[PDB]
UniProtKB/Swiss-Prot annotation, chains A, B, C:
The normal, monomeric form has a mainly alpha-helical structure. The disease-associated, protease-resistant form forms amyloid fibrils containing a cross-beta spine, formed by a steric zipper of superposed beta-strands. Disease mutations may favor intermolecular contacts via short beta strands, and may thereby trigger oligomerization. Contains an N-terminal region composed of octamer repeats. At low copper concentrations, the sidechains of His residues from three or four repeats contribute to the binding of a single copper ion. Alternatively, a copper ion can be bound by interaction with the sidechain and backbone amide nitrogen of a single His residue. The observed copper binding stoichiometry suggests that two repeat regions cooperate to stabilize the binding of a single copper ion. At higher copper concentrations, each octamer can bind one copper ion by interactions with the His sidechain and Gly backbone atoms. Belongs to the prion family. The chain holds residues 95 to 227 of 254 of the full protein. GO terms for cellular component: cell surface; cytosol; dendrite; endoplasmic reticulum; Golgi apparatus; inclusion body; membrane raft; nuclear membrane. It comes from Mesocricetus auratus. Glycans are attached at N87, N100. Residues 1-130 are annotated as: PrP27-30 (protease resistant core). Keywords: Amyloid, Cell cycle, Cell membrane, Copper, Disulfide bond, Glycoprotein, Golgi apparatus, GPI-anchor, Growth arrest, Lipoprotein, Membrane, Metal-binding, Prion, Repeat, Signal, Zinc. Monomer and homodimer. Has a tendency to aggregate into amyloid fibrils containing a cross-beta spine, formed by a steric zipper of superposed beta-strands. Soluble oligomers may represent an intermediate stage on the path to fibril formation. Copper binding may promote oligomerization. Interacts with GRB2, APP, ERI3/PRNPIP and SYN1. Mislocalized cytosolically exposed PrP interacts with MGRN1; this interaction alters MGRN1 subcellular location and causes lysosomal enlargement. Interacts with APP. Interacts with KIAA1191. Interacts with ADGRG6. The gene is PRNP. This is Major prion protein. Residues 1-130 are annotated as: Interaction with GRB2, ERI3 and SYN1. One of its GO terms (biological process) is neuron projection maintenance.
Length: 130, 130, 130
């Protein structure tokens, strides 16, 4: 004879996002790829009594992994920025009190802020006078 | 004879998003890809009594993985920005008190803010006088 | 005869994101790749009684791993920035009090902030006078 009792008392299980793809305030975006943040799983579990006599299983499988990885990548620009440019403060004040002459004031690119947490492949900059 | 009892008391299970694709305030967007944040799973579970005598299963499968990965990627621009440019403060004040002459004031790009958390492949900039 | 009792008292399990891909405020983005932050797992577990007599399993598998890794990568620009440019303070003040002459003031690129946490492959910069 066989007897199998199973009397759990108030069991609690949390299988949220089990064997799945979860993304929370993230980026799963690439220029290239074949498997980015995916799930291909075959998990097995038991939580009670189990009993097996004479089985055959999981024998003579043939699943070799064969890959030819030949990409060409040239003159690209990729950047991954996380938590950059935090708590930046810039202050630039000016105070002037003034009181038969000739004055001239010529200025270029005065009090300029540029390129805070930017990415580029190429740039040029010409700032001159004649 | 065979007997199988199963008397759980108030069991709690959370299988939200199990073996699925979940995205919460995220981006799953790429230029290229074959599997981005997907789920291809075959999970098995039992939560009570189990009993099996003489079965044959999961034998002589043939599922080899064969891939030819040959992309061409040239002169692209990709960027992944997460939590950038937080808590930025810029302050630029000016105070002037003034009291037979010739004055001249020529300024270019005065008090300019530029390119805060931008991306680019190329740029040029000409700021000059004649 | 066979007897199997299973009487757990208030068991608690946390299988959140088990055998899956999870991303929380991260980037899983690359220029190239074949498996980036993926899951290919076959975990087995039991949490109660178990009993097995005469089984055959997991025999004569053939799953060799064969890869030809031949990529070409030329003139690329990639950068991974995490927690850069934190708590930056810049202060540049100016105070002037003034009271038959000829004045001339010529300035270029005066009080400039540039290139805070930027990436580049190439740049040029010309700042001159004539």
């Amino acid at each position: 004879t066989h007897n199998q009792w199973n009397k759990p008392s108030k069991p609690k299980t949390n299988m949220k996002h089990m064997a799945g793809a979860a993304a929370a305030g993230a980026v799963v975006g690439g220029l290239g790829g074949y498997m980015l943040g995916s799930a291909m799983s075959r998990p097995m579990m038991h939580f009670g009594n189990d009993w097996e006599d004479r089985y055959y299983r999981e024998n003579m499988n043939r699943y070799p992994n064969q890959v030819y990885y030949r990409p060409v990548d040239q003159y690209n620009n990729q950047n991954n920025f996380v938590h950059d440019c935090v708590n930046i403060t810039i202050k630039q004040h000016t105070v002037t009190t003034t009181t038969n002459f000739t004055e001239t004031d010529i200025k270029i690119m005065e009090r300029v802020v540029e390129q805070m947490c930017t990415t580029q492949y190429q740039k040029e900059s010409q700032a001159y006078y004649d």
